């Protein structure tokens, strides 16, 4: 009913390992489109949303509409069976009690069953290193719980305030030729200046291993949405709600 | 009457690491054949042998039987103080109340004396790489307490079950001309199938510092043997009844 | 009032790092001559002494006297923002209320305002690779709460005493000509054994990153001086007096 092969296990791998500190429990939902996820965090503050589309698999084959219950404490003892070049395939029958997992080589051969649960179901946009993004959060979690985030047509301030003192972080808009990976790029309508949590950013930021680039997208009507490209129109999304 | 020079101090630190985690109190057997190694480990579970030939030493020199009743742990701490490179010197007396280890890089000479302790005294063969036999046994570790090892003249199967499912990982038998370090040998009598602790044999895989091919030996009336060369005819060998 | 701009940050970080295991609150002591640290540790048993000359930066300026108070453990908060490339910038005005740090890479540019505190004012000489020290230091303490170290003109030896058994390292004097990073040199008037802590000189091991070499002069009746070359006449200094 499901089968659906990655020519690298790695994508998979990284996804699990960007979202088991937010999920638990959540479901893969497999359909003809691909295998999406959408899940609150365990204190029903972040949106986490991914897609894996159909044209990332080598082949992709989903017969029925699939909903693949999943611990992902569970999961990560499986994946980490998996080495970032093997051949991965998920096999799935019609309202599955399991999840067949496959990881192939060096003529080895590992294979999985894993058991599912019953589990109930911009203003502004900054182009950046996802490295950058992680650096910055990361520093500022260590002064301060809260980060300011302004943007404007000239470049990005990261602003906060502790016991200590404060601290910011200004990187300028900039097109970098030679290195385009390194670029900071602001399509932006109306500059914005908006409150969140670094503890749940640095969460986000675990997905830096996805995309050397990531998107900051900020509103001030709808939650900020970090996210991370995993190749083609296939994403991992982050959605969280400014301070108010 | 005891003085064993190793070329490298490399092999006795790996021997010792791969060692202290099942063994705390041990006697090393000295004679004219080398250096011996007997224990069982402080559950009364797994047997420890190991032998050091005297072709292993420039030069080997042991006059008289000698017991040296050493505490791993101590032994530990005065190991960490040789470079794997330096020149690893052991001297002892007739009953010696010490052992005296010397060792020499860079126009540096370390000298310890350690205090010696009173301490009382196959159907199938797989040859394979050690990192392999480590990442399969630490990998189903996460899934079980258990391993079911099957044997045929065409491949190995590692298998197991636990809370969230079971695996299986699959080893075909392969000659490989270009690196042979990497091949999957099984010289075999009767097909077998022998069910283990994993808990051991993650502690046994510990050695793997020490030989880039490992040897399972399954028999269905003796325990497995999982054994490491230490160059030519010296060993680290340990003994793991099946669960019955 | 302050100015001071180091071409690279890593010197500063490595410093502190160097020194926030012994000292959590002290002043950085700022005039015409640079910026100066002197601190007993918690157990006011070690003397912390550092200089910054003048020249150190590019460029410096310091109009008056000034004491910044700090904590250690705030002041790494900040200095882990900084990359080890960064462009660093103390900023300072009369009687401060705080100390303005600033980074500047890539187009960014981060900038801390820290809050300062209300802080409260050889017979024989060896040179030798730092790495080496710290190895002896580290090593002995395994063994040994206490090290004694005798100096004469053919070499040093580090000699201990533990439950496990004892210990020695000996390093003869050796002009290393092809790698003069790796010469012992002994400048001595008089043979001398003195026995330390092994605690404090492994926590003075700490700063062997700012410096490949190490000073250790030894006296018969003034504290052992440990050394640390920062570039030019500036300097890390460490004291401790021997055990009697």
């Given at each position: 009913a499901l089968e659906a092969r990655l020519e690298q296990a790695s994508i998979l791998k990284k996804v699990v390992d960007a979202i088991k500190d937010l999920v638990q429990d959540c479901n893969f939902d497999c359909n003809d489109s691909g295998i999406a996820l959408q899940a609150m965090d365990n204190s029903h503050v972040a949106l986490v949303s991914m897609m894996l589309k159909?044209?990332?698999?080598?082949p992709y084959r989903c017969d029925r509409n699939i909903a693949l219950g999943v611990n992902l404490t569970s999961l990560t003892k499986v994946l980490?069976?998996?080495?970032?070049?093997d051949i991965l395939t998920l096999k799935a029958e019609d309202a599955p009690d399991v999840l067949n997992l496959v990881f192939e080589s060096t003529d080895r051969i590992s294979e999985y069953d894993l058991k599912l649960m019953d589990i109930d179901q911009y203003a502004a946009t900054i182009t950046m290193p996802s490295n950058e993004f992680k650096r910055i959060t990361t520093d500022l979690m260590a002064m301060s719980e809260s980060v300011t985030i302004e943007a404007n047509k000239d470049g990005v301030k990261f602003s906060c305030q502790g016991d200590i003192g404060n601290g910011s972080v200004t990187l300028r808009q900039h097109t970098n030729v030679?290195?385009?990976?390194?670029s900071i790029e602001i399509e932006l309508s109306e500059p914005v200046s908006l409150t969140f949590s670094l503890k749940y950013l640095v969460n986000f930021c675990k997905a830096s291993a996805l995309s050397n680039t990531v998107k900051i997208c900020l509103s001030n009507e709808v939650p900020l949405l970090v996210e991370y490209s995993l190749g083609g129109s296939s994403y991992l999304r982050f959605y969280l709600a400014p301070k108010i």
């Open positions: 159909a044209e990332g698999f080598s980490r069976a998996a080495q970032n070049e030679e290195k385009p990976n390194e």
